[PDB]
Structure 1
């Protein structure tokens, strides 16, 4: 069994401490550190803890996933190694805790598997590497590099090289990495995999990047818009659906070689996109990224590979047929982001929802007067606007569960009510002298 193999790696690598990882409703990693003597208990009856943290009655159990056992490559003190285990949350009786984000994606994937569907995701993870002043993080870029720039213009080549190496040691396959448009911005794209593996790997990337950045006196951040006037970090999600082993989005006889299932999936996602934005763009800062002038999509449209739209259908066909949903940012909870896209996309397929016409023209160049005539909508401008749209979307509330949906609304409203009352420096700079 897998448990035997885990104990074999423990003795071989001299593992002494194990981190029982899990994630709250906001995508923040949480854990319980246990000595290796308690590993047998963790894989058996499980370890008890207070699940108040998940919300961000109290007694809950951690159920480690044996497939996620990985040794942390940063060797601990004096040859003693550390290991991690991604855990599912269960109630004391044994039934799964429906408030756990990982359980939510698992449920939505099981409902898709009933209809022979399996969703594969391949995200493009953008992030910034900032300097640290007096031990505290800042928003000052480490390098003054631009798109696909090379060293010495790109100073973060060593750290990025270490990130990709550390990931490959943990059964991770990376496609390519490069410097992005903004100063100190970078991107690491990894290959497609099932939504659950992908979500686990997204959490691991953020953890690894932030850990290795601190080792070099830097701070890695996946914040959507840390600097005004420059490009913001996005999480473009390449998505494809696979029915009975074959790619359900490929039809060689249909026009553009795009199957009917793809058009319905796009139609479903675009129908609930205003509600999905509350999950995929969950911070108040996420809406400072959704502004015109940068690579981020703001208008609700879909097109081919020759236009920067919300959904893009790349040229590659065959097994690589897919859609690139470009609205999410890397601060979203990946477990809930993929669950929301899968539920909206499958409703598209089930109800045969036809998507709008493919806008191939440049949407920013088109006049606002013409957009209303075509029928082109806009994504929510504020977090409150997206939460109000999410609150009404009965499908996403049921797909994510009432517990998770309520927690998202409570956290977002608490942040919005605090942000809206604040007096920002822009207001003093604009009015104090004159008024």
Structure 2
């Protein structure tokens, strides 16, 4: 996959070359389109100790090699392209990196012709910017699950994200107000574990 050509074709001006650390933190570097070909082949350098990877400030940089098939133009900002990456250290995948660790287990299972597929139901709350209370002061009842009123009160945000997921080809199919006040969930189709994992990281 020719990221440089895609950038010109799709009008992508910056790429986020991203990896997930041991604490689930999304680590990313913002690279201008002019530099993507270099990063695609060689990876993007990061000081590994600065993320949750259990390294040393004395270690050589890790190189995050992007998976070109993971490319997502941010639906809310299409001029930026997100890529999930495998952390490499000293010329090979780094076993302490989550995505690398997953791919290792998947390869052992695949060797036995067993392929994991999964789907995730990622519940979340919508809260005030300061985090102190839910976003909807009118969502108060003891049993709020599937509350039509509170659900529609957040239609704009929920509908925007659902429609992004349609466009992204994830096959979204239901959006719910969940059992806690202020809590929601948006489902999408299961897939090969690696695909779902990347989608999961991006979704949040």
**CA deviations over 1:348-396 (Å, ceiling 9, x no partner):** xxxxxxxxxxxxxxxxxxxxxxxxxxxxxxxxxxxxxxxxxxxxxxxxx
Task: Please identify which structure carries the higher helix content.
Answer: 1
May I ask how many residue pairs the two structures share in their alignment? 195
Which structure has the higher relative contact order (CA within 8 Å, separation 6+)?
Answer: 2
Q: Is residue 126 from structure 1 mapped to residue 123 from structure 2 by the alignment?
A: yes
Partner of 1:417: none
For the 8 Å contact 1:23–1:101, the answer to whether it is kept is yes
Partner of 1:176: 174
TM-superposed deviation, 1:138: 2.3
TM-superposed deviation, 1:88: 0.4
TM-superposed deviation, 1:195: 1.2
Partner of 1:165: 163
Partner of 2:133: 139
For the 8 Å contact 1:141–1:183, the answer to whether it is kept is no
For the 8 Å contact 1:144–1:154, the answer to whether it is kept is no
Partner of 2:73: 71
Unaligned runs of at least 5 residues, structure 1: 207-435
> Partners of 2:42 and 2:202 in 1: how far apart?
25
Partner of 2:34: 37
Q: Comparing 170-179 with 110-119, which one deviates more in the overlay?
A: 170-179
**CA deviations over 1:371-422 (Å, ceiling 9, x no partner):** xxxxxxxxxxxxxxxxxxxxxxxxxxxxxxxxxxxxxxxxxxxxxxxxxxxx
For the 8 Å contact 2:117–2:192, the answer to whether it is kept is yes
Rg (Cα) greater in structure: 1
Unaligned runs of at least 5 residues, structure 2: none
Residue 139 and residue 117 in structure 1: after superposition, are their counterparts in 2 closer, same or farther (change >3 A)?
Answer: same
Partner of 2:186: 188
Q: In angstroms, what is the RMSD of aligned CA positions?
A: 1.8
> Partners of 1:63 and 1:166 in 2: how far apart?
26
TM-superposed deviation, 1:8: 3.5
What TM-score results when the alignment is normalised by the length of structure 2?
0.88
Pairing 1:19-418 to 2, within 5 Å after superposition: 19-52=16-49, 53-55=51-53, 57-75=59-77, 81-92=79-90, 94-132=91-129, 136-142=130-136, 143-144=138-139, 146-151=144-149, 154-206=152-204
TM-superposed deviation, 1:164: 1.2
